[PDB]
Design a protein around this nucleic acid. Structure first.
Ligand code: MG
Length: 577
DNA sequence: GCGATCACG
DNA sequence: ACGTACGTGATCGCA
């Protein structure tokens, strides 16, 4: 039972409560709050938001850091409230982040899924209540109120068991000192948004519609026929049946036309280079011009991403609607998209700071590999040094092709090395790749010992860990299926590296936000892209940021090798290079 | 809805 | 003998 309240009472404002501030729309930016539930020592309450959020005592309670709240996905509530000019403080327990740290593979995305981890089933999945996709809707008040009170009651009854298990895992500080403070910082970043130069985007797309038409007509002429270049089935028929190009592959999905296949097919027909170019331009038009403009707010011309903090299996963030972690940079034609990402105020600039080789520096630290540690203590070009070691040549004798192949070896080492995977990447034989790998481990025997030991540890304990005690369970490590077991072995090798790098930049974000506040700088974090942080600030703060941001990022943790941070700034994101 | 594809670190 | 590089999200075509 619970109270369907018509007005806020003092009983509802106790100094510890489970709080539900329900936002049903997936994108919570400027979205409605459909209902509120409070569970505390005095009872269970459902409040209508138009009543509660207009009540000064309830708003003061929400903003009082000394009034502690337990929630699920507090960032969603905090951001929805920010759009209403209401501050949420005092969130001491977030069940979504607790569940994520205990086991990221559960895919916990609602209270019911977290509750099932502790045999609590007296709450419905959100999808059962609201529906999926187009059939989605807020139910009538009796159904909605019971659901919100059941979620608040579940949070109330799950905080202790979840904290107990986090404690046993030595993850309690990871929740309270890393993920929960980070959630508030991410909320600020998403709410600030990034300003988009939409007229430049519209022009850029224009440059693109003309070039697409040009290459599309060239492809039709070369194919001797007009067809749907973007259809995988149709392209494969044109290439491999009409034009009779060679098929170097498997499976029975018609034919693969991925860029790695087309790059090998290019010497056989002029059409292949044009299809690759058409693919590049069409990706920019559909995803990064048209798709971006769809989610720009028409009034402010800002995009407000949502950073999913409880999704990836390694501890990284992800970014949605739009994804601001995969904006084009590698080819110049795509890189120009970043000219459309601009500071949100006049006379401000974009400032970008990135870790240099954080994953291999983490590997040097965790493996305690003498040669790799010394390479970073000398601040060597790690791919040139790896080439020197594996091909047994002096620095002057490293050719560009040697550095390229050594770089691919380094990628494989971080991903979880295999002769098959390296051979596929470098387009060489498994035996040739195995020789590269053997040479690598002769030069980096500590890395070899580390990789052997971490796979054995994953088998023994059932999971692997990161520097700050994030965990990933790997039950497939004991599979008698070669493919299944090999997947788990690569995850055992990769997750402590990628995940520790994620831990470090998350701590850097917390440290940076604190330093920006101490210095009373106007600079603000806008984005994180795995190993880099993107800020905007007044032009008059650039000199201070050039010293502050790299130092904070470099000092976030202390490893057996230095951390190194590069930085750039300019008038647009493109120019911060 | 799902696989293929390609964008990023 | 075995055959996938690690981690993500958006779009498209097609069933
Ligand atoms: Mg970098």
């Amino acid at each position: 039972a619970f109270t369907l309240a018509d007005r806020v009472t003092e009983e509802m404002l106790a100094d510890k409560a489970a709080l539900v501030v329900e936002v049903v729309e997936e994108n919570y930016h400027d979205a409605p709050i459909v209902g509120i539930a409070v569970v505390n020592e005095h009872g269970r309450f459902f409040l209508r938001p138009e009543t509660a959020l207009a009540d000064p005592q309830f708003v003061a309670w929400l903003g009082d850091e000394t009034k502690k709240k337990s929630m699920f996905d507090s960032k969603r509530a905090a951001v929805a409230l920010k759009w209403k000019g209401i501050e949420l403080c005092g969130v001491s327990f977030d069940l979504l982040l607790a569940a994520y740290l205990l086991d990221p593979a559960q895919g916990v995305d609602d209270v019911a899924a977290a509750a099932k981890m502790k045999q609590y089933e007296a709450v419905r999945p959100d999808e059962a209540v609201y529906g999926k996709g187009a059939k989605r809707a807020v139910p009538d008040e009796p159904v909605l109120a019971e659901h919100l009170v059941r979620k608040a009651a579940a949070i109330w009854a799950l905080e202790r068991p979840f904290l107990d298990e986090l404690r046993r895992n030595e993850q309690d500080r990871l929740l309270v000192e890393l993920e929960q403070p980070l959630s508030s910082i991410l909320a600020e970043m998403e709410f600030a948004g990034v300003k988009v130069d939409t007229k430049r985007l519209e022009q850029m797309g224009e440059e693109l519609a003309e070039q697409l038409r040009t290459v599309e007509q060239r492809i039709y002429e070369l194919a001797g026929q007009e067809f749907n270049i973007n259809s995988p089935k149709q392209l494969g028929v044109i290439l491999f049946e009409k034009l009779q190009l060679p098929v170097l592959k498997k499976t029975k999905t018609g034919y693969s036309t991925s860029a790695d296949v087309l790059e090998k097919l290019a010497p056989y027909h002029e059409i292949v280079e044009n299809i690759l170019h058409y693919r590049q331009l069409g990706k920019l038009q559909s995803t990064y011009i048209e798709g971006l403009l769809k989610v720009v707010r028409p009034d402010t011309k800002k995009v407000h991403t949502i950073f999913n903090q409880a999704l990836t299996q390694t501890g990284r963030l992800s970014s949605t609607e739009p994804n601001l972690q995969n904006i084009p940079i590698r080819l110049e034609e795509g890189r120009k998209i970043r000219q459309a990402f601009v500071p949100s105020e006049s006379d401000w600039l974009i400032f970008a700071a990135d870790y240099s080789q954080i994953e291999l520096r983490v590997l040097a630290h965790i493996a305690e590999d003498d040669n790799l540690m010394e390479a970073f203590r000398r601040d060597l070009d790690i791919h040139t040094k790896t080439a020197m070691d594996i091909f047994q040549v002096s620095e002057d004798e490293v050719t560009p092709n040697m550095r390229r192949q050594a770089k691919a070896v380094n990628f494989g080492i971080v991903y979880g090395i295999s002769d098959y995977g390296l051979a596929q990447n470098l387009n060489i034989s498994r035996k040739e790749a195995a020789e590269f790998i053997e040479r690598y481990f002769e030069s980096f025997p500590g890395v070899k010992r580390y990789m052997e030991n971490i796979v054995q540890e994953a088998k023994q304990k059932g999971y692997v860990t990161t520097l700050l005690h994030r965990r990933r369970y790997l039950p497939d490590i004991t599979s008698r299926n070669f493919n299944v077991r090999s997947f788990a072995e690569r995850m055992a090798m990769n997750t402590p590296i990628q995940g520790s790098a994620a831990d470090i930049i998350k701590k850097a974000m917390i440290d940076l936000n604190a330093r920006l506040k101490e210095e009373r700088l106007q600079a603000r974090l806008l984005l994180q892209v795995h190993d880099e942080l993107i800020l905007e600030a007044p032009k008059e703060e650039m000199e201070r940021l050039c010293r502050l941001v790299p130092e904070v990022m470099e000092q976030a943790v202390t490893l057996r090798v230095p951390l190194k941070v590069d930085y750039h700034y300019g008038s647009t994101w493109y120019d911060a290079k």
